[PDB]
Amino acid sequence: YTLSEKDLKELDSIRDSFQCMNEPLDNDQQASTLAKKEHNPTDILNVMDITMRRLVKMAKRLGAFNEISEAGKFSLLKGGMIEMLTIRGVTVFNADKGVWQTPVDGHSQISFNMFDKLRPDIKDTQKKGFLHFFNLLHSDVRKNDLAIDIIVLMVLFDSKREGLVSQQDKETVEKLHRNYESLLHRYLYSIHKEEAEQRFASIPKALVALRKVAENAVTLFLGAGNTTEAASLPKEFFATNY
Amino acid sequence: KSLLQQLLTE
Numbered sequence A: 001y002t003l004s005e006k007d008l009k010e011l012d013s014i015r016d017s018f019q020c021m022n023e024p025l026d027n028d029q030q031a032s033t034l035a036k037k038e039h040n041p042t043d044i045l046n047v048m049d050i051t052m053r054r055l056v057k058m059a060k061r062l063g064a065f066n067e068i069s070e071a072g073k074f075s076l077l078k079g080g081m082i083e084m085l086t087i088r089g090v091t092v093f094n095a096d097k098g099v100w101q102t103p104v105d106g107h108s109q110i111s112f113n114m115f116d117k118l119r120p121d122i123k124d125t126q127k128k129g130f131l132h133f134f135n136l137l138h139s140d141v142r143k144n145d146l147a148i149d150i151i152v153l154m155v156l157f158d159s160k161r162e163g164l165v166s167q168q169d170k171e172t173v174e175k176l177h178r179n180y181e182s183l184l185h186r187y188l189y190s191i192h193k194e195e196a197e198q199r200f201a202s203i204p205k206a207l208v209a210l211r212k213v214a215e216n217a218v219t220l221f222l223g224a225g226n227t228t229e230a231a232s233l234p235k236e237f238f239a240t241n242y
Numbered sequence B: 001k002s003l004l005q006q007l008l009t010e
């Protein structure tokens, strides 16, 4: 049935936090890297920089996020960044076309076969692991902005990230996670009661796949060629010999 | 010291 006014207020807050995700780049070097007919490893790192900076901006403008200590903020971001990227990758990915279509830049696509340039002995596993995670997030849920926005906040507030040592941080993250999950539960029933329960019960399995896929993604740029000119931020998460 | 951290602070 319908959502309470309190839930709607929360969903408004969440809608405002993520409204920065799908918006035009006011940069030209950035829009140039996207509209690029070709994406080598250096270019992929540059594209990631865009989503990551936007991811970090979204975390800052989040009330719940500003309830954690400074040390807790860093640990949450560093630890869930590849996971949130991947989620973001799920939501703009075209299964049949095999490319990523960003809403912020029409006529701009990124080949799924860019993995073919990445670490040789691992690119195949990561390709398969990405389609796996994707295939665990049904269409109806993947197309729902709010639904995926909620899951993005559940992976963000992971009480088990390396570095969350403050008992206070751990407690507040745990509570935030519980509430976000509940919201998603009631939200799912309000938009499609027919099979909300099985849909909600399957997403934790998908989150297990996301973790695993993101985790062995860190070395993907080893053996991929010179990336020295790539943006610096993404290189703090992806190992390089340059 | 860590662009991530700086992005957080600023």
Ligand SMILES: C[C@H](CCC[C@@H](C)[C@H]1CC[C@H]2C3=CC[C@H]4CC(=O)CC[C@]4(C)[C@H]3CC[C@]12C)C(=O)O
Binding pocket: A034, A044, A047, A048, A050, A051, A082, A085, A086, A088, A089, A090, A092, A100, A102, A103, A104, A105, A110, A126, A127, A130, A213, A214, A216, A217, A220
């Ligand atoms: C305009 C820009 C487009 C972003 C597309 C983005 C969501 C894609 C491009 C490259 C993709 C990945 C690269 C390394 C791989 C490495 C893996 O094995 C997991 C998936 C991962 C992170 C994907 C996720 C989706 C990404 C970042 C944006 O929306 O900010």
